[PDB]
Design a binder for this molecule. Structure first.
Ligand SMILES: C[n+]1cccc(Br)c1
Lengths: 39, 156
């Protein structure tokens, strides 16, 4: 049995921690909703 | 139950203790999450029940109490923020420049940030605070890193 609990407001934070790269990938999406890499 | 707009954890007591299986967004009286978090099951909010209303396994999305309401889109140029809600930890904003998933049916934004599986359904926002999609359906690339699609539904 699943239940929900509030965790916060949805707002943009000024000066949030900035990280992560921006990869450009060729991908395929199957009927089950799974993404996979195309090589 | 609680109908206030915002980000929520999705919990279960089926396993050991209370376990966080994902996250979702309450907006305009509708609860939005990824299909793989709830498998389309009903949810409890205090003493109230939220029934599924729309869902799609291929999009990996589901809405409760009404139709999908989120329609903002990534502009393809600007940094966005993941409003990560990890299990047992406080909600935290992470800013990033999305990459791209190129598919036979078009391109989708993607965020290269690695959080526990229970963070699935966390919202990705633009600079106006609008939800441009949900984090948690993606792929594992060559160097073993996780990259999530920015998954957004259609507002009918
Ligand atoms: C399925 N999965 C794996 C890693 C991180 C996330 Br969010 C989801």
């Amino acid at each position: 049995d699943m239940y929900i609990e509030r965790a916060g407001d949805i707002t943009w934070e000024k000066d949030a921690e900035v990280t992560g790269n921006s990869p450009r990938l060729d991908v395929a999406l199957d009927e089950s909703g799974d993404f996979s890499l195309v090589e | 139950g609680e109908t206030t707009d915002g980000v929520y954890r999705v919990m279960t007591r089926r396993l050991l203790g209370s376990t966080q299986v994902g996250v979702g967004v309450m907006q305009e009286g509708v609860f939005h999450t990824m299909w793989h978090v709830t498998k389309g099951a009903a949810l409890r909010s205090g003493e109230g029940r939220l029934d599924p209303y729309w869902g799609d396994v291929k999009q990996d999305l589901v809405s409760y109490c009404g139709p999908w309401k989120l329609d903002a889109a990534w502009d393809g140029l600007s940094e966005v923020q993941l409003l990560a809600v990890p299990p047992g930890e406080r909600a935290k904003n992470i800013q990033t420049l999305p990459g791209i998933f190129k598919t036979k049916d078009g391109d989708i934004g993607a965020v290269a940030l690695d959080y526990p599986a229970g963070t699935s359904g966390s919202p990705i926002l633009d600079k106006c605070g609008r939800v441009i999609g949900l984090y948690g359906n993606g792929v594992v690339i060559k160097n073993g890193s996780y990259v999530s699609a920015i998954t957004q539904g259609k507002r009918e």
